[PDB]
A and B are shown apart, each in its own frame.
Chain A
Amino acid sequence: MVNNINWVKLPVILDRLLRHPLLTDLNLETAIQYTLDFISAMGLPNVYVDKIETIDIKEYRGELPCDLISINQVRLHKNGIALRAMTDNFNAYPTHGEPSFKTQGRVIFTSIKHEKVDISYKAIMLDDEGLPLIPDNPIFLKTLELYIKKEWFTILFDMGKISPAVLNNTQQEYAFKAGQCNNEFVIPSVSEMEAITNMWNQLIPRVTEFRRGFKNLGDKEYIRVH
């Protein structure tokens, strides 16, 4: 992402929607739900807050933080060696290796019995209220506004209170801005294309960046003169 994510409260999206006199029955409560549907459906990893927590595994199980949304990596605390993924069907089960993890709910399922693990994860940024906080990006803000205008107009079109030409314009305009908003958040900055440059140009290919926290991923590869 080229621009920085400056945070603003959710009611800044309601100044923009209630400029439209057909969207004047909108609420904070409706703006809360349609934001989280929009934040999810875009899947932009720049909208989330990166956190790291150390949890302790009791017997192939550990309790996961409350704010966790997606795990970046799980690693061991004493080694720093990262855990990949549990493909075993019979993991902590005895009959009569490379460590792994698996997460379903608020429980993580590891391959190690009694160990502390660091979990680097993503959460949602909150307010003084326990409410979501959105980027002030006028591309993000415009297409979140067009998201809610397209969900409200879809209800109104089912009711028969909106022209099919009106909904077709809103469905088209949200469809353009959703790609512009995707490209706004995905396309790297100059400082991220340098780390992409160093990963791409490697005379001796570095193929074990998952073992670290992808720390040396964008590091530059140097060759001695001889």
Chain B
Amino acid sequence: RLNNPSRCHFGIVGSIYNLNDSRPFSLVDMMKPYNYLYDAIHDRLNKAIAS
């Protein structure tokens, strides 16, 4: 930077998609409860189909 000699970084650029200094509650994280419940009910479906 033109005016700050201590301001530098590496090539690594990125971001966390979080809310208010927290750990990111991702799109998969908010859909993973309903995917785990879909796997449990379709298990009951498959044993009902079989018998």
Contact = CB atoms under 8 A, between A and B. Distances in A.
Interface in A170-206: 200-203
A174 B49 CA distance: 43
B42 to A, nearest CB: 13
Contacts of B46: 203
B49, B50, B51 pick with most chain A CB within 10 angstroms: B50
Contacts of B47: 201
A16 to B, nearest CB: 44
Contacts of A202: 50
A221 to B, nearest CB: 8
A24 B50 CA distance: 58
A148 to B, nearest CB: 44
A201 B51 CA distance: 4
Contacts of A200: 51
A203 B51 CA distance: 7
Interface string A34-60: 000000000000000000000000000
9 contacts: A200-B51, A201-B47, A201-B50, A201-B51, A202-B50, A203-B46, A203-B49, A203-B50, A221-B50
Which 3 interchain pairs have the tightest Cβ spacing?
A: A203-B50, A201-B51, A201-B50
Given A200-B51, A203-B46, A221-B50, 6 more contacts: A201-B47, A201-B50, A201-B51, A202-B50, A203-B49, A203-B50
Interface of A: 200-203, 221
